[PDB]
Structure formats: structure tokens, C-alpha cells
Ligand binder design. Structure first.
Ligand SMILES: Nc1ncnc2c1ncn2[C@H]1C[C@H](O)[C@@H](COP(=O)(O)OP(=O)(O)OP(=O)(O)O)O1
Ligand SMILES: Nc1ncnc2c1ncn2[C@H]1C[C@H](O)[C@@H](COP(=O)(O)OP(=O)(O)OP(=O)(O)O)O1
Ligand SMILES: Nc1ncnc2c1ncn2[C@H]1C[C@H](O)[C@@H](COP(=O)(O)OP(=O)(O)OP(=O)(O)O)O1
Ligand SMILES: Nc1ncnc2c1ncn2[C@H]1C[C@H](O)[C@@H](COP(=O)(O)OP(=O)(O)OP(=O)(O)O)O1
Ligand SMILES: [Mg+2]
Ligand SMILES: [Mg+2]
Ligand SMILES: [Mg+2]
Ligand SMILES: [Mg+2]
Lengths: 481, 481, 481, 481
């Protein structure tokens, strides 16, 4: 067979190798046509209808482009068509593990439905890749095009999820180390997945992005670092890398962590939780699985898509009413109402174990105002969001290697003070959002007082609309002045 | 009640009136989030993931733009905010009647499922609009914002479907006739819907459009024509208008009538015909409807979306196997194979009543060549496509009124000979595409000989790859050399 | 040393070879920064400030892209780095011959200043290329990077103007004929220069471009045709090629032949004509040249740019008053007034030998209207414009070779009846624009009556606003009624 | 006299009022077609060919847009056609005072040619506005359209340059204070000029901008502050505002302060300095001026554009040799060579005067390494660049008024800790770039040793390629390991 050409609005005409086509034309991959990239963001940004499928295509194409560029600039690295096909495949397949509504599923649902297990979309991706390989007879096709299934499949999996366990990888030796920072870079977070979602998400949201990945590619080289071969970026591009991480953060604050989009994620998740017992998904040899257990059999997970949302919505079965009314309340646009936003202070970090107590703290309060309605802990929703640069408290650029024009083979490091004084002093922070499930005017007035007083009692940041929603409470805190 | 801001990637930030917001936040409208704009096009153009929802938002915005501009340039027309709201609503609601996969439903499925009925997505839009209004108590909100729920609802329905029924309209008098040319122009085909889908479809498909609607709005005026006040375009813009229809014709040949997209639409349609009997949709008071009858109950139709595709695909019920396997053959990318394209010659035109008798002609052929297989009528698929400028054999520009710079109130006509000699001399044509349901190396050869000999015997145009795929048949037709 | 990366808004980051950098950094090439692409178009389309310099970079980049793509898809053609460099240089240098305001210089000025010579910007490009090579010591630099100046310079010049003379080219043998179809296609007109100016001009004008050159490149092959190797496009792309020429025609009708832009070009040409005697340019060895004679000495021509305009405008010499006053009339926006447009009918074609006699025909007209003022031939300007598809009366795609999917090396022809019946049946046409040098309302009124009466007497088409600007004249014409 | 429509690639079709057309069509305004926006930036970014003319149009359009939007949301403000026209004119005319190559003229040339005057394009715009008004008889035209010349012209000037001296303005009273915040905002720097050049510069440079001015406009209100009516932004948009100032800071580091572009600015300034005495420009009543003194007569300044560059490059007079030979090394691309970049720490700030003592310091260093050549202060160029957020050391966001959704009429303040912890803690910084005038390999090597030794001796940051370009010098400073 020959190569297929496909037109992507982001990257233009991309060439696809017959093996990649053979991987694409399977139920396991086509499953991604039915999973939205941004999940509930589509209920806020009407343009964001894009799915994981096209994003996967773009990641594969970009992986191929970067590996090919590095290959043509430096032939001494001995990159083969085999390495290219493999990295392209890893790129194509690192999104196979996503559940319905993407990050809502593994970031919100699974932790609440099955709090005893440890699940990540990466692991879902490796399992679904294995299932994909075996159920469709791919191995002989791999062999036809020059791959060695045992070494190569391993290399692909390690590319997607990291080591499956001194040099920890089995798929490629150290002098091809640079094959491992491309599809999913565990060292600093700079990888082609980000590059594709920057361009796609922006193309669809109606926000435009200032990061030029093609430029970074033009300036990328392979360097010798601590006796291994790593990707080196030209020194003069360090600023751009900072901006790359600034851009990411921006995309989170206007779009990915939008208050309403997130509360819609919470509502869909609660609906799914109240539908978890009554929905049956058919898995291996007829055996029956549930939404929360589908992650344990890939034949079941395969049939787990965004469609579940609609299954609940068009359902007539009375055991599903409680969830169905929630999903109907999304259609009528009767959402939980947003109360406000604040931040922790000092060295205070809201740890995961206390996310469960917070609505009670909010419901306690010491307000001192006409208390015409009482709110109980259940009436409050508290969302804690962690905003970082990809490596928690650390600075990712301290983990990137550079080269200069006078010596393009001398890898060097670059520190923050060498760049600018206008950069951040921190690289992680927490945001706290509070919502009230009671939408009436009196419940809102009250919820605001409870909220602000709660913020005062915890020595948190003063709400931006503090003087507004709580005029009688704000002069309680002397340092908010 | 206040105003909502929406970010659309095509139009930017759009302001939505509380009354419009109220209509949008209903299941009848939100239903459109689950119906893809281009249907089977997403299986060819991976960017085309957009749905009818955002498209509707966009039509609604543009109608308002045009009527508002007309209102500001010529205060003498005394257009009121009420007229504006009615036109905006008409804009929002002219797409409500679409079935699963849009044009596949009313253009392929319904005519084969119900050849006795006359059904259009327009009438469906009217019905679903009535249902939307009634089920959500919109009339009092309409009165609240200054509308007359009797005159106005009528006006909106007439805007979507035309006359119900000199002056055939009842919603607005002759002296506001131009308000009937904005949302759906039955006179010449120039309306805001085309303008939105040009820009949106082009934005997502990855092909770009050369038509500037903002310019057209700037140059649009209301003039008196045959005792009515109609929208007139500036004379020097006639060239642009011809180009507009050329653009429409381009988008069809590249995307909307793509051979593979059309064969996927046909395969899904076939699946739906083979699943129609065994799938029941819950309608009024609990009564059950089938896909082909859902168009007769609006609360049932409400639940008829693309989701139906996945339900069939995830079914375990054996009565759906024959339907379920075809869609599975779409996942594996084992589609009906394209044999070719040809055109009739002289002035013979294929009517709908012969679309059913046509594959028999192709199989009844008597090709003089060493073959290997005999094929039967059931093995061929013949798709007839009508490409026109919107009004069949007519030239739509002969139905546009123009004005000149020196006398901006005097409407004039412009004939084709006054514009260019490089324009088309015909405005309708038929394309015939032939596919074979047998995909083997030898059945394709035969199907090709049948096809070409059929083209010769009916005196059609010679297929572009005629001499290569059927070297032994082409010299029989002297008229191709 | 090594290669330079340059950022272009149209093509992104492009790599430049040291030899190309060396060619670019000369006064002969840098001269193109001071010559506007669209000349007088910038006085109508304020975005069109782009010059010939960047356009040249883009042509070189696209030439290199196409030749590299052909090289990678088909190694059997034996394309070398040397062929690539030569095609890139030819691309970079085919615009070197342009005069001030580009086509105004070669299309309007020179024919009036020196009507005895036959001059084109191509020959100018070859001459300026010879001068560039000799004056900057490029030959030894050419030799260093693996070029053979004797063959190679010839190859480049032939690439720009064709043969300087049974294979007529000496720079490359027949098995490399396809290399002559890239930079300047004398056969059918499909070349990279058009591809760059579509995208650039559209990017700057505020018009959108509907041609995808990257797609065309992806589908380009080298095929065998009549004992030669030609560039061939896939059969399925014939429509896109027609649309390309329609696009070109649209860009001409909207921008390049804009009535006002053309009248500004004409006024500047008059300026240069009335300044020709009084402006002296120092050329080779001190000899002094005039604007109209600079084209015969390249050291003078190097110095011939748009700057001249300003030199005339800032002049204090009373001998330059006549020109300086016309340029000031360009600044105050007192332009010749546009009267109207008409075109011939039947079989009438206006030859160039008759362009001087036309305003006299116009003043010789006898409109039956009471005129307070009489206008003489001196007051009229008549501009005849030839609109074609590049090859006069022929259809250029009758001269492109195609290939089919089943046999990618077998070239075929495709006729117009095989594509569509909605295409043009003619490929050339003439437009006639008439302007009046007298700007007052009464002279305009008069000029219009003269014009329309002339159109009637010559049996031309009726002006679009005929009935409005000449109400008393149009009902005389039997075929306009 | 009617309304004129103009096509701008950034803003689309823009409407220009007959009075605005009359202002635009003057030599004083049209001069801006011949002054590059980014100056020597065009010699690095081949796309940056745009002039200040098409930027001025855009500023006027944006001014009109913002004031009209504010007028439409809040009719209580009593905005008149007169206020809108004045704001538009102010927009159109705030760039009139720009010299050859824009900022290069006022930021580099005048202080070196004439260090005794205080000259800025701000005052120049006012002066040139007066000259335009008087020399072209605009005042009666202003009256024709309903303006009062005496207050209104004052208003316009005060909008461009600020107060011409408790309420300090005379052109408009206290209840219209917000009209002074549109065209040039002296309080915080958020104004429409930035908005136009962000989009334009990005459109042409080949970089994309992530700031959405249309959104800001949609969310802008007039709130009451300290007895003024000021522009208020919605609170939750504060993040975007920070980004705005970040994008600007980005645009400076990538384009406006590009290392090569600045040295090209410096060289052109050098040519002009060595040419100032020998170039004479004709001003008022025949009196003759020099490049540096033309700013003292506006009809002379009128004729002062980028053209002088060419006037110099094209000179044969031996008095111009020193200036003409430098512009020639720009064409040949033999520029001053870049050696490096560094920054001070703590509280050391490079004062404006000591900019002269710096070339002495760099050469005064004593690196103990084999140096083939000794360099003197004249061989060095040291350029100090100030990077800030617009108000030196302060945070402009502490000077913005915000409002809340629940009470849209009371302005509130927002501190940095209320937004995020990921922002800069300083808002101004200095960059130091050092270049060498001798381009040979050894003089360059030496210059590097000198430079790094100077950086070490002054306790500055380590040059990014420090360990590479000067290996024998960096290991001495322990704070660089
Ligand atoms: N005229 C067009 N312009 C731009 N893109 C197109 C056009 N036609 C199709 N596309 C898109 C759709 C696909 O994503 C991609 C490939 O389309 P296409 O060339 O028709 O492949 P194909 O498989 O249908 O034809 P074939 O199998 O005969 O080679 O480009
Ligand atoms: N920073 C942003 N930039 C661009 N678009 C945005 C941004 N934030 C949100 N949007 C989009 C998402 C929506 O389509 C639309 C509405 O945004 P937004 O103002 O946040 O609505 P909202 O309803 O959540 O605010 P609120 O109810 O408080 O007034 O604009
Ligand atoms: N940060 C940037 N982002 C996008 N484009 C840039 C950026 N910086 C410069 N450019 C543009 C300007 C040029 O046209 C092109 C390359 O410039 P640049 O990379 O700075 O080369 P350079 O010659 O100035 O440095 P060097 O010689 O050290 O490589 O890209
Ligand atoms: N077909 C077009 N599409 C897009 N832009 C155009 C087109 N034609 C002209 N333009 C541009 C050029 C101008 O900047 C702006 C307006 O031009 P235009 O409408 O042709 O003015 P005009 O000179 O014809 O006015 P008038 O009606 O008095 O003749 O739009
Ligand atoms: Mg194919
Ligand atoms: Mg809201
Ligand atoms: Mg460089
Ligand atoms: Mg005009």
C-alpha cells in the first residue's frame, strides 16, 4: 500500500504511513472521535467541539516532524525510519487512555467512585494500546514495515508512560536517549502534546496563542549532557520557553479552569456517580461492567465514551431519575451559583485529605449579620485548583539544556537571573472557588457572608468583590486595608 | 434580567439578549449540540467536528448585524428593536428541525424511509419551534420584552419556512418586506446562513473562503422595487456576488459532496434503514416511535440525535446485527469502493424517480472484455448529485436589485453580459458517481468495465481516468477522441 | 559560514543557504526593498505596503520547496543539491528587473517614453543578475559551494527568460526539463511566483486567498509526456487548478486593476514623463542617465527606485514644477475622475495600435443633451485592460499534464467538458475604462454623456449605471432595451 | 460629500467621516506613508514594511469604537457626535510628529545631534496638527459638521500631549473625564494605540498576539471615581490586563529590541549624524534647514521622511562620503558585531549620563589571556535598554479601577496578591548589550575577553554563553560556580 494524505486545519496536509493508517482504522482508536478534548468547556466555549482523535493525529505528526528535523540536521545520530515510525506511533497513541470528558473522568470521577485504586490516563493508554495491538492483528504489519515488535512495542509503551520498572529504559539504548523527551517529556514537560493542544485549543476557543513551536524545532539540536544524548535548545530561545509556560498558565485561567465550566464538570460527575450502580456495560465474553469498573477491562472501556452522558439523558428507567434531573438541570442552565475565589497564604497548602471537610468549615462561620436563611455544609461546593509549571514547586527551565552559536555542541545550563528580573518568584499556587447549590437571592446573600467570613477566619486573600458582597464583614480583617 | 457575552471563534464576542438566552437554554435548542454540521464529513475532514448549535448562534448574530446596519443607515424605514429580536430569533431557530447528521437525514434517509411524505428540515424547524415555545412558557417572556406573541411568532415561522397561505405574508406588511430577505432568502438565495457556514465550515475543514460578508453589509441598502422595499446591493459589487455562488459551488465539490464522505453518509443511512424497525424512541406520554416516525412527534424528535449512531454501535441485541456490522465496517474503514464519476451530455437530466432503477442499468451492461466476475444490480451504488447556483437553471444575479453611487435610492438590474464574459453560461449540472459493494481486486476491475461501457452506451462524458482503468473500452466511443 | 534563519509572516521560518545570503546582501538585490509590489495599489489598499524584496524571498523558498519535494518523492529523477541551489537562486532573482512601482514602470511608463524598444522586467532581471554576479565576486563563491558558473548562470538566466536562442535549452538536458517549469512557467503559467503573490498580496490587501499551494505540492509528480519529463498534477485536482486561475482573475478584478489605483498609476506615469528630461542618474563610469534610459545601464538602474517619486515631490527646481504639481494633486486627492466602464461585443477586439485614437473618438461623440461646456480629446483618458487566463485566448489547463491513482507515471490530458459545464467558455476579454481630467460637476456630467453616447455608437455593452448617469441617452439603444 | 469605506487587513472595512477624509488628504498626514513603523526592524523582520499611516487609521478607528461603545451602554453620559469626532481625530493625529524611522529619530538621533532641546514626538504631533489645520483650511470644514473649533482643537491637542499647563484640562469638563483615557492614557498606559500596534505589528512581524481588545471593550464601563467619571474594567478581567502588559514586554524582547535591529538603528543614526550639516531641507519662505533643525519648522519637517536615507545612499558628493559609506556596509551587511548581553543586580542602576563612560570601561579591562590586538574605547558600542511595564518602577494595575457584576457603578481597587503569586515582583529592569566595531576574528575574540572580564569586574550576570566564548576567564568568579 501507499501513504494517505489527510487535511488538518491546524497543521495542513499531513502524510500518514500505511502502518499508522492501520493503527488508526480500529475501534480502539476511533473511540477517540467520541471524547471531547476540553470536556465541559464546550458548555462555555461553543467553539470547543473538538475531540481527542484529531489532537492525536496532530501529536503524531509533530512527533514525526521533530524527530525528522533532528535526524536531518545531525546524521551522526543514526536515526532510522524505524525510530521515526515508533515515535510517531507513541505520539498517535498517548491519548488512547482518556475516558468520557477527558480530564473530568480521571481527575474528578474515578477518585470519587473508586477511591482505593490509583488510575491515570497514561496507564489507560498503555493498556488500551496493548489491547489495540492484539485484537486487530497489528504485529505482523509491524514486522512487514521493519519493526521488531518485542523491542519496539516496549519502546512505545515506555515513551507513553515512562519506565515500566543507571539506565532504566529497555526499548532504546542511551545514545538514543533523545527519543524519550519528545512524546511525553518527564524531565521538564516540554513535548509535542503541549504544542498541539496550544494550537488546537486556541484555534477552537477563540483565543490566540503566542508560542511558535516551528521556531523551537528549527533551533533544536542534539547535545551531549552528563554522558547521554539530550535535546538542546538554542540559548537565545530561553525567553520563549518561559513564555511557553506562561501561555500554558494563561490557557488554564481563562479556559481550562473557568468557574462555570468546572462547575459543569462537577455536575456531570455527580450525575455519573448517581448513575454508577444502574448502568451496565458489556465487557469480556459477555461479562458485565459498570462505568467505574470499565477501567479494568479494555473491551468495556472501548465502549465507554461521552455517549454515556446522553444515555442517562434519554433514559426512562426510574433508577436513573436522580442523575437525569441533574443532567436536565444543565440543559435548563440551572447550575450551582458561583460565590467567590480566594488563595491561601504563607506556607499553607490545601492538601487533598481535607477537601472533604471544607464545606463544613464554610458552613460553620462566625458572620454576625441578619441571618434570614441558614446554609448547611451540603449547600456549599469547594473547588481547590493547583496551578503550576508542570513540576510542582520547581522551575522546568532549570531542567532544559542549551547550546550557543559559537559552540553548537557544548550543552550549557541557564538560570533565571541570567534571563530577566520580571519573571515569577513562585511556580506553584492554589486557587479556591466556592459555590452555593441554593440559587435564591437570600441564599446567595447568606452564602457570600459565610464565604467572606470564612476567608477572614482562615487568613486567606480578600475576595476581589469583597467590599461588595460583604460590606459589613470586610473591615474585620486589618491587613485587607 | 441582563445580557450574556459569548466567545465564538468566527465572530468573536457576541452579545445575547435575555430573551434569546431564554430560548437557547431549552432542550429543544441544546439538542443541536449533538448534531454535527457536516455529518459524515468528520470522517474525511477531521477538523469538521462542529455542530449545529454554534452555527445557529452565528446565524442569529449575523441576521441582527444586517438588520441593525440597515436600521442605522436609513432611519426612514423605522425598524424597531422588536423587528430586530424577531429576526434574531428566526436566525437562531431555522436549524432546529435537523435530524441526525444534518443533510443525511432529510436528504437520504427520510426519502428512502418515507417516500410518500414531503419533508424538509425547514418545516421540522417550524414544528420544533412551536414545541419549544409551548413546552417552556416563552410567550410571557416575549410579551415581557415588548413582542406580540401572535403577530411575531407568525413572522418568525414565515421567516423560516416562507408563506403559509399580492402580498402572501401575514407577519409583516409590504413596507417591511426586506425583513423577509435576511434569514432565508427564497428570492435569490443570498442570506446570512450561507455567510455563517462559509466562514465556520472553512474555519474547521482547513480550506479557506474568499467571500467577505462584512463588506456586503457595509454596501447594503433598502430601495423600492415593484412597490416593495427590498435589500439592494451596490452595483460595483455584482462581481463579488457571482464569486459568492462560485464559492458555494467550490465548497460542495471539495467537501460537502466528497466521494468518500458521501459513501459514508450512504452507509450510515443504510444502517439506519436496517435498524428502523428495532429501535424505539420515547415520545408523548410514553408512546414509542421509530427513527422514521420521530419526525411526527417533537418531544421524541428532540431525543433523535447523532447518539443514535452509537446506540446501534453499542447494541448487543442480535436483531440489530445486520445494522450494527455496517457501522463496524465504517470503524474498520472497509467502505464501498469508488469506481468513478461521469456526466450526462446535451440536455438530458436525471429525475429522482430514476434513482431507484439506475444500478440495474449499470449491471444490465454488456462490456466486450475478458472479465472474471458477473455482478448483479444489488452490488452497485449510484449517487446522483445536483450542482447549481441555488435556483436550478436560473441565474440568481438576475434576481438581485442594485443601486448606483449617484442615485442610492434608485434600484436597477444588471445582466450577465454587463459584468464579464468569463462567467458561466449554465447554472446547473449533474454529476453521477458509481461505487461497488464488492471490494476485491477482481470485482473492482469488472465494476470499472461495466461503469465505463455504461458511460459510453448512454453517451455520457468520458471518466477522467478512462484510458488507464479501462484501456480496452474507451476507443469504442469515437466522441472521446 | 553557516545558514541563516529568516522569519516571514507568510511562510514562517525559512532557512537560507550561505550562497543565497551572499546573493541577497548586494545593492542590486537590496534595491528591491524600495520598490512596492503593487505600486499605486498602496494608495487604495493601505495594507499593501509590502515591497519586492520579501516577495522574492518567498518565491525562492517556494521554488526550493517544490524542487525538494519532487526530489524526495522520486529519487529516480536524480535531483542534486546543485539543482536545488540553482532553482532557489533563479527564484530569488526573477524580480530583480522591476522598475519603480513595479508594473507601472514596465506596463505604462516605458511604452510611452521609449515606444521603439521592446522591454520586459524579465530581461531586466537577467541583465541585473549579470551585473550582480560580476560586480560582487559571486562566481568564486558559486564555485566553493559546488556550482559550475558556466553552466549554472546560464541555467538560471534561462530559468528566468527562457532560451536565449529540438531541445532549445543549454543549461540543463531534457531529463531535467521539469526544472524549467518551477520558477517561471512559459508553458502554462503555473509557477511558484503566483503562489507567493496570492498569499502575500492577499495577506496584505485584506482579501482572503482560496488557493492551497501546499496541497498542490503534496500531489505533484514528474511524469513522462511526449518524450519529455514534465511536472504533473493528480487527476482529482483539475478543479483546484481552474479555481486557481479564477482566483488570479478575482485578484485582478478587485485589486490589481482597481480603477482608482490604475488612475494613480497613470498620474504617476505622467509625472515621470514630465520629469524625464530634468532628472539625471549617474551610471557606469560617471555617465549620466535619465529615468527612461536607466534601463540600458545597470549601475544607473540599481539606483532607479520608488524614491524618485519623493525626489520629484521634494524638488525646488522650477524645471520640475509640472511634475511636482501633479504629485501634489495626488497628495490632495484631486484625481482624474472615473466616468465608467464598458466592454466590446460580438467579435470586436481592440488592437494596441488604436489606443491613442480613442479619446478622440470619445470627444467626437454627439450626445443629444444640453451641455454648458464642451470637452476636447485632451480631457479624456481611455484605459484598455486585457483580462485573460495567462495565454490569451487559450485555456492554460489544456497545457497541464495529469496522472491517475492507478498509474502514477502515465500522463493523461483532461478536457473542459470532463470537469464541469459551469466553467468559462472564454478565457480572454477586454475592459474599457474612461476617465476625465476635468474634475468639476458639470464637466463630469458632460463626460458621462459623451462616454455613454460613444458606447452606444461603438456597439459596446451598456455601463452598469447607464440609466442613472445618462438617462437621456440609454433609451436610444435597441439592444439595451 | 459622503462616507468613505476603507479596507484594512487588521480591522476590516472601516468607515471614515467626510471631515476625517479631509484631514487625511493633506501632505502633513500623507507624509506618514513614508515613515516605517518599526524602522530598522524592517532590516531584520522582512515582513515589517508597514508605515505609520495605516497605524494611524487603525488608532482612529479604535478610538471611535471605544467611545461609541461606552456611549451606547450608558446613555446617561451624554456623548455627542462631536465628542466621537474629536476622539477619532485625536486618534488619527497622535502619530503626526514621528520622524524618519519613527523612534530611532526621537530616541537616538535628536539627543545626539541636538542634546540641548527637549523634543518628543508628542509635542511634534501637536505642532504638526496645528500646521495641518492652518495650512489646509480645516476649521470651516469642522464647522460644517458641527464642531466648535476653539474648544475642540484644544481638546484634541490635550488628548495627544496631555495638559497645556484641580482639573487641569480646558478642552472638556469634569463629567467627560473618561474621554481623556481613550487615545493616550497618562494614568496607566492602557489606550487604543497599544491595541492597534499589537495586532498590526504582530500581523506583519510573523508573531501572534494573545491580547483581545474587543473583549476589553465589551467589558468597559464608566464608573465614578474621586469626583471623576473614569473608565472601569470588570474585576475578573484583571488577569487579562496583566497579560496585556506581559505581551507588550514580550513584543519588545522579540522584535522592538532585537540585538541586530538596534545596531542597524545605531548605524543609520550614525550616518545621519555625519550627514546633518551637508543636507539642506527647504522650509518656510525658502529658508534652509538641516535634518536636526527641521523640527523647528513644520513645512520643512513635512518633507522629512525615510527618503533621506536614500538621499544619502544615492549621493555622489564627497562631503557625504563618511555618511554614504556606512549606509553601504548595511547593504553589504557588514554590521558592528554583537559580543554580548548582561544585567546588574541589587540597587545598581545605569544612569542616563554614564552611558558615555561605558565604552571607556569595557576597554579599560585587563583580561589575562593571549590577546592578539588591543582595542580602544572607539572600537566598542554599549547600548543600555530600559524594559518596564510603562510606569518605571510601579505597577500600572494599581492604577486601574474595576467593577463587580453585582454593582456595576462603584469602582474598586485590586492588589497584586489578590490576583496571583506568579507575577513579577519588580516591574522595571535594565539590559546591557555590547557590540564591536571591528568585525575580524581576532578583534572579535579579544572583544569577548574584554566584555566578559568587564562583566565579572562589575558583578553583573554571567553572559549566557560565558563558559563557551571565554573559557579561561569565567572560572574566577565563584558566584558562577
Ligand atoms: N479540494 C481539496 N482541498 C483541500 N483539501 C481537500 C480537498 N479535497 C479533499 N481534501 C482533504 C480531505 C482529506 O482530509 C484530505 C485528503 O482528501 P483526498 O485527496 O480526496 O483523499 P482520498 O482518499 O479521498 O482520494 P484518493 O484515495 O483517490 O487518493 O484532504
Ligand atoms: N479570558 C477570556 N478570554 C476570551 N474569552 C473568554 C475569557 N474568559 C471567558 N471567555 C469566554 C467564554 C464564554 O464563551 C464567554 C463568556 O465569558 P465569561 O465572561 O467568563 O462569562 P461568565 O458568565 O462566566 O461571567 P459572569 O457571569 O460573571 O459575568 O467568553
Ligand atoms: N523570539 C522570536 N520569535 C519569533 N521570531 C523571531 C524571534 N526573534 C527573532 N525573530 C525573527 C527575526 C528574524 O527574521 C528571524 C531570526 O532572527 P534571529 O534568530 O534573532 O537571528 P540572529 O542573526 O539575530 O541571531 P544569531 O546570529 O545569533 O543566530 O526570526
Ligand atoms: N472587491 C473588494 N473586496 C475587498 N476589498 C475591496 C474590494 N474592492 C475594493 N476594496 C477595498 C479598497 C479600498 O480600500 C476599500 C474601498 O474601495 P472601493 O469600495 O472600491 O472605493 P471606491 O473608490 O470604488 O468608491 P466609489 O464608490 O466612490 O467609487 O476596499
Ligand atoms: Mg485515500
Ligand atoms: Mg455568567
Ligand atoms: Mg545572525
Ligand atoms: Mg470612491
Amino acid at each position: 500500500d501507499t501513504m494517505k494524505v489527510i487535511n488538518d486545519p491546524i497543521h495542513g496536509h499531513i502524510e500518514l504511513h500505511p502502518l499508522l493508517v492501520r493503527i488508526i482504522d480500529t475501534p480502539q482508536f476511533q473511540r477517540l472521535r467520541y471524547i471531547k478534548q476540553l470536556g465541559g468547556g464546550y458548555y462555555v466555549f461553543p467553539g470547543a467541539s473538538h475531540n481527542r482523535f484529531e489532537h492525536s493525529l496532530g501529536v503524531g505528526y509533530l512527533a514525526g516532524c521533530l524527530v525528522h528535523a533532528l535526524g536531518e540536521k545531525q546524521p551522526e545520530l543514526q536515526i532510522s525510519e524505524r525510530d521515526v515510525l515508533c515515535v510517531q506511533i507513541a505520539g498517535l497513541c498517548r491519548n488512547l487512555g482518556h475516558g468520557p470528558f477527558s480530564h473530568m473522568f480521571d481527575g474528578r470521577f474515578i477518585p470519587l467512585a473508586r477511591p482505593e485504586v490509583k488510575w491515570t490516563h497514561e496507564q489507560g493508554s498503555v493498556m488500551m494500546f496493548e489491547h489495540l495491538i492484539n485484537s486487530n492483528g497489528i504485529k505482523p504489519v509491524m514486522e512487514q514495515y521493519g519493526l521488531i515488535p518485542e523491542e519496539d512495542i516496549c519502546f512505545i509503551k515506555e515513551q507513553i508512560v515512562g519506565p515500566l520498572e543507571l539506565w532504566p529504559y529497555k526499548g532504546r539504548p542511551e545514545n538514543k536517549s533523545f527519543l524519550y523527551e519528545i512524546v511525553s517529556n518527564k524531565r521538564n514537560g516540554i513535548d509535542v502534546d503541549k504544542w498541539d493542544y496550544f494550537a488546537r485549543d486556541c484555534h477552537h476557543l477563540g483565543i490566540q496563542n503566542n508560542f511558535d513551536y516551528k521556531r523551537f524545532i528549527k533551533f533544536a539540536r542534539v547535545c551531549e549532557v552528563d554522558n547521554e544524548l539530550r535535546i538542546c535548545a538554542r540559548d537565545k530561545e530561553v525567553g520563549n520557553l518561559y513564555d511557553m509556560f506562561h501561555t500554558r498558565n494563561s490557557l488554564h485561567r481563562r479556559a481550562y479552569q473557568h468557574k462555570v465550566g468546572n462547575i459543569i464538570d462537577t455536575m456531570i460527575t455527580d450525575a455519573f456517580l448517581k448513575a454508577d450502580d444502574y448502568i451496565e456495560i458489556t465487557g469480556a465474553g459477555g461479562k458485565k461492567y459498570r462505568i467505574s469498573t470499565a477501567i479494568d477491562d479494555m473491551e468495556a472501556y472501548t465502549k465507554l465514551t461521552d455517549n454515556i452522558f446522553l444515555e442517562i439523558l434519554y433514559s426512562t428507567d426510574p433508577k436513573l431519575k436522580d442523575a437525569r434531573e441533574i443532567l436536565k438541570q444543565i440543559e435548563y442552565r440551572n447550575l450551582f451559583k458561583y460565590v467567590g475565589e480566594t488563595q491561601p497564604t504563607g506556607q499553607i497548602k490545601i492538601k487533598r485529605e481535607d477537601y472533604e471537610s471544607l464545606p463544613k468549615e464554610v458552613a460553620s462561620a462566625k458572620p454576625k449579620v441578619l441571618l434570614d436563611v441558614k446554609l448547611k455544609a451540603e449547600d456549599f461546593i469547594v473547588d481547590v485548583i493547583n496551578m503550576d509549571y508542570g513540576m510542582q514547586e520547581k522551575n522546568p527551565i532549570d531542567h532544559v539544556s542549551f547550546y550557543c552559536k559559537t559552540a553548537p555542541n557544548r550543552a550549557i545550563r541557564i538560570t533565571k537571573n541570567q534571563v530577566s528580573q520580571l519573571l515569577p518568584e513562585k511556580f506553584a499556587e492554589q486557587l479556591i472557588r466556592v459555590y452555593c447549590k441554593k440559587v435564591d437571592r437570600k441564599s446567595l446573600y447568606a452564602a457570600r457572608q459565610y464565604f467572606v467570613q470564612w476567608c477572614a477566619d482562615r487568613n486567606f486573600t480578600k475576595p476581589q468583590d469583597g467590599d461588595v458582597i460583604a460590606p459589613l464583614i470586610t473591615p474585620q480583617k486589618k491587613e485587607w486595608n
